[PDB]
Amino acid sequence: AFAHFVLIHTICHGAWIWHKLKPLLEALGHKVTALDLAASGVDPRQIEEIGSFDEYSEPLLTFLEALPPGEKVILVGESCGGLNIAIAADKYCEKIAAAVFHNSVLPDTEHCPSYVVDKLMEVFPDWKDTTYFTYTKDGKEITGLKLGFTLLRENLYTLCGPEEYELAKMLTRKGSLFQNILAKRPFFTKEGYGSIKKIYVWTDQDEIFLPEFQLWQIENYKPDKVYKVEGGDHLLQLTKTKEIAEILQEVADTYN
Amino acid sequence: AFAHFVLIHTICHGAWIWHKLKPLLEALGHKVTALDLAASGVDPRQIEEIGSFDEYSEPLLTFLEALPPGEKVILVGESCGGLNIAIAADKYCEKIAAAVFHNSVLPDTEHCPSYVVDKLMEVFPDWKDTTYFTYTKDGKEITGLKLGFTLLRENLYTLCGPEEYELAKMLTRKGSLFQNILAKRPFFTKEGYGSIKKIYVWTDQDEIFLPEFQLWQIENYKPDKVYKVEGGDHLLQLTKTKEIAEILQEVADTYN
């Protein structure tokens, strides 16, 4: 079967991270939308204009709003994209056939929104040459960051080619986890986010979202289906593009 | 020998177009700077804020200004990047060891700045699905454009892979040729731009900067050296990356 996939990048990243997977999915006959979230990729906004993970998700929310009644899509989020998925699901669960997590955070409904993010910081505390800054928006102090080039090279693009890593150095922008804002945000709902089908894709060779963290998330919030890709790195859409497309095809044939 | 190359993208493009060539040049021991011009790539400005090709060149001019006395670089421009080179040379000729034109416009000093651009429009009048718009800046009506996806696919990324073409669809932004502004701009000088060494690189398989146009430019303003690459397409830094690096190495060993 064919499906309409909506690819969601992580903070500091942009739609460009999906430049290899998107054409492959289309070669399978699927419809693919790869969005730039607020202040990401070529979006015109700067991070200082964004005050929460929800505002950061605007482009995704607006896209879903534009979907005619009856049209469903399969969301695919990488790394922190899982949070965008949760936010979107509490607003448009009926338009989501399923959500696919790609080495991504997996929020739940029993703990506050920042729960898995706080856990991630515990498992991976050293972000190496990543730099941080602060700005104020809507009366709150937000911590912004810019992923370090060494961190990118060693933990994210571990096995990616130098041509792919180059795009990261040229295109990655300042972003934020809005961690303190997530902590005070209303919990994700059981009726919205809790009701959607969730497929968890990962590899134990991920050098940033370590096995301890990912296995911890799976035990914390049981996915409907779990796919483990052998080898590759954190950026499976670059190092295991073909494998990811095959998994997404199966998801398309399973959930609608 | 080693040199410091400054790669300059064309309008509607960004530094990302050099993601393959930059690491290759560095693997040869060179220092490489790939800039995002105004309102291009991840530059924060929008095209409506730019009123001339000179303002558009700001990032290049600012970069050259920051070069300590005695430090020279080799400029490499693609397509319309040749105009940025001419503008930069009339301000920092002493900091330019040489300029390399990569399937690029080659301005002269005998005709107005828009001369070769006007000729290009005559040789390649149909830009297919490219769209146009107008905005006003500093009392002038400027024609902006957004390269059509079909034009990109068929004439620019002719022989490039679908993964490279995807980046173009995801990253290309609105831009402008500032043609009417160039027409009224003071002529490029013989003492500045006219004095720098110019190396012309091209391929007769270019589907947008056609052989008629490029051979016309070579006859119009005789380059110090001409390199013709067999095969490939308009984007030789993607389809003939290795060949381009070898040519640039020879340039580095020739001009300093």
A96: amino acid identity, one letter? I
Is the Cβ of B34 closer than 8 Å to some Cβ of chain A? yes
Of the candidates A20, A46, A163, the beta carbon closest to that of B19 is on A163
Tally of structural domains, chain B: 1
A170, B20: Cβ pair inside 8 Å? no
Chain B residue numbers with beta carbons less than 8 Å from the beta carbon of A164 are: 19
- A173 interfacial to chain B (CB closer than 8 Å): yes
Joined tokens for residue B83: 């105009």
Residues of B assigned a catalytic role: 79, 234
**The pairing of beta strand B31-35 with beta strand A73-79:** unpaired
Phi, then psi, of A174 in degrees rounded to 5: -65, 145
Query: Do the Cβ atoms of A167 and B46 come within 8 Å?
Result: no
Residues from chain B that touch A15, judged by Cβ atoms under 8 A, are 170
Flag if B19 and A44 touch (Cβ within 8 Å).
Answer: no
For B235, other C-beta atoms within 10 Å of its C-beta total 28
A107 near A83, Cβ under 8 Å?
A: yes
Q: How far apart are CA A228 and CA A244, in angstroms?
A: 10
Of A46, A164, A167, the CB nearest to B44: A46
What are the tokens at B187? 């002529």
Contact A163, B19 (CB under 8 A): yes
Q: Which of B22, B170, B171 sits opposite A166 (nearest CB)?
A: B22
Strand order in the sheet with B31-35: B31-35, B4-8, B73-79, B96-104, B198-202, B225-228
Backbone angles phi, psi at A170, to 5 degrees: -80, -35
Q: Supply the DSSP string of B133-197, one letter for each residue.
A: EEEEETTEEEEEEE--HHHIIIIISTTS-HHHHHHHHHH---EE--HHHHHTSPPPPTTTGGGS-
Domain that holds residue A5: 1-256
Is the Cβ–Cβ distance between A249 and A162 less than 8 Å? no
Host H or E run for residue A73: strand A73-79
Question: What angle in degrees, to the nearest 10, is found between the helix axes of A211-220 and A115-123?
Answer: 150
Q: Do A166 and B41 touch (CB under 8 A)?
A: no
Is A15 within 8 Å of chain B by CB?
Answer: yes
- Distance CA(A193)–CA(A195), nearest Å, equals 5
Q: Which residues of B81-100 are buried (b: 16+ CB within 10 A; e: fewer)?
A: bbbbbbbbbbbbbebbbbbb
Q: Please choose, from the candidates A13, A2, A3, the residue with its C-alpha nearest in 3D space to the C-alpha of residue A35.
A: A13
Find the length of chain A.
256
Residues of B in contact with A162 (CB under 8 A): 23
- Closest chain A residue to the Cα of B22, Cα to Cα: A166
Write the CATH number for A208: 3.40.50.1820
CA nearest to A158, candidates A238, A42, A79: A238
- The span from the CA of B33 to the CA of B79, in Å, is 18
The experimental method is X-ray
Substitution target from A43, A170, A239 for chain B, most B beta carbons within 10 A:
A170
Closest CA to A247 of A113, A98, A132: A98
Assess contact for A227 and A198: CB atoms under 8 A: no
Distances (CA, A) of A52 to A49, A80, B42: 10, 14, 22
Q: Which of B26, B163, B173, B239 would best serve as a mutation to test chain A binding (most A beta carbons within 10 A)?
A: B163
- 3-state percent helix, strand, coil for chain A, nearest multiple of 5: 40, 20, 40
Q: Which residues of A touch B46 (CB under 8 A)?
A: 44
Please indicate whether, in this complex, the C-beta atoms of B19 and A46 are within 8 angstroms of each other. no
Q: At how many Å resolution was this determined?
A: 2.2
Angle between helices A58-65 and A81-92 (to 10 degrees): 40
Q: Choose among B82, B101, B83: nearest CA to B228.
A: B101
The residue with tokens 């004439």 is B155
Write out the two tokens for B105.
């416009």
For A251, what's the count of Cα atoms within 13 Å in the CB-facing half-sphere? Answer: 31
Question: Could you give the C-alpha distances from A122 to A70, A77, A118, A201, in angstroms and in order?
Answer: 42, 22, 7, 22
Contacts of A107 (CB under 8 A, 6+ apart): A82, A83, A86, A113, A115, A116, A188, A193, A221
Residue type, B45: R
In a mutational test of the A interface, the residue from B36, B171, B173 whose CB has the highest number of chain A CBs within 10 Å is B171
Chain B interface includes A59 (CB < 8 A)? no
